Amino acid sequence: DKFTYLLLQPLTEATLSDAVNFIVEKYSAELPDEGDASLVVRSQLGCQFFFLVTRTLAHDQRELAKLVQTLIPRPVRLEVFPGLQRSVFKSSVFLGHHIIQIFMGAKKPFQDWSFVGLAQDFECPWRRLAIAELLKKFSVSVVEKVFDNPVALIPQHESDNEALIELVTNALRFALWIVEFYETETNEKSIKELAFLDHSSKTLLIESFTKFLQGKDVKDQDHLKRIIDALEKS
Amino acid sequence: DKFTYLLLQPLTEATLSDAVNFIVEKYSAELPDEGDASLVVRSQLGCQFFFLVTRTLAHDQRELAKLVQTLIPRPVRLEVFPGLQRSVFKSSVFLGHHIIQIFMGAKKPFQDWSFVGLAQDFECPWRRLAIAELLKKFSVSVVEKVFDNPVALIPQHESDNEALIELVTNALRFALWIVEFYETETNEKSIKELAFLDHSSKTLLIESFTKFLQGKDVKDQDHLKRIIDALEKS
């Protein structure tokens, strides 16, 4: 009741904080117990945190997404963002937000990939693996039933909830493709993994990246050009 | 030198133990340090453990795969198998071994899915997520360069190393499909995600599962029949 009420409110820093605090209280109750049942509860609670992250990405409130990590006490943070996932959460949020907003039609401006550290993170294979792990968690958190009661991704968007989830999960799948086919974008096997993409989403990506690359650092322009080329060849 | 020598020896309980002990020593050196650099080292070391797991699966030594978890001290185990991954490692090893061996042509017998606890694990969405996370780790560990020096997946199999890795990663991708499309196997969108599969591997799966289901518990037979149906419709 109380929890469902929080989750249905308009997305604000206050409502996000109260929701996170509630999930943390449930998580904290499990920490002293190390049997399997507790691990299963904590897995589900983890997905509830990532549902809140993905919902803020989809509602174009990227600052609130980043904030979720801050609002979680460190002992819990160590389990919800294991290992290198803690370090690359900022980049994963940035990339997930960027691609979800392109899919939703947003006409920019997005921040520079080199400036925000995403370009550098891409250069490390272990950071690429951790970013992919987080993008996957964002996606599963809005597909699985993470709460025992249904909760629309975007507050007040009920009849169109399935449509929005479809769009957002397709966006996150493309964000995952960017990471997993870094510097192999136009290989035949890579292009085959774009078969899932609607033609209209593909065109929105092409148009967005064609504007984005203008004036950027040369290495970023080359990267974006490979992605555009792959989209046109698919 | 010493490490490369270990990794090139025939796979035995002794050689596996010595290899794990070496990686643990490197990991233990990182534990007191919590800056980003240490997290990156530990991510790579984690993938080295999973390379050893996948190599034992591919060499039909499933008992040695399970053993890797045992040979890792608990403080390290908490980071390498985070959260629920510790609980479902047994099932992930079982399923990964089963599917890799079908792809390699093995003519059985495999253990009963209900008897070994895999069927029960499938029933829980959070356990399904954790199994998928581990199957993905098995796959990336043999594709990425986890050691600074090249090391063939199967000792003495050098010229055919690329071929074996291709086969094993395709097998693990199909194991992942089984988990991620549990009880939605013959849906149109699910069948589209079988496009990656060679026709001959598809036939080997059909023949193997058709023998496997005989005499099994009815729920296991139904599950296997849905998988077979999906393969035939792809």
UniProtKB/Swiss-Prot annotation, chains A, B:
Region annotation Involved in dimerization: where it falls in the sequence: 1-234
Subcellular location: Cytoplasmic granule
Highest taxon above the source species: Eukaryota
Catalytic residues identified in the record: 223
Record remark on domains: The dimerization domain also acts as a hinge; changes in its structure probably impact oligomerization and RNA-binding.
Assembly and binders: Homodimer. Interacts with pgl-2 and pgl-3; this association is not required for P-granule localization of either pgl-2 or pgl-3. Interacts with ife-1. Interacts with prmt-1; the interaction is direct. Interacts with nmad-1. Interacts with P granule components meg-1, meg-3 and meg-4.
Function description: Guanyl-specific endoribonuclease which cleaves the phosphodiester bond in single-stranded RNA between the 3'-guanylic residue and the 5'-OH residue of adjacent nucleotide, resulting in the formation of a corresponding 2',3'-cyclic phosphate intermediate. Essential role in male and female postembryonic germline development; maternally provided protein maintains a population of proliferating germ cells and zygotic expression is required for correct oogenesis. Together with the P-granule component pgl-3, is involved in the formation of P-granules.
The protein's name: Guanyl-specific ribonuclease pgl-1
Organism: Caenorhabditis remanei (Caenorhabditis vulgaris)
Organism lineage: Eukaryota, Metazoa, Ecdysozoa, Nematoda, Chromadorea
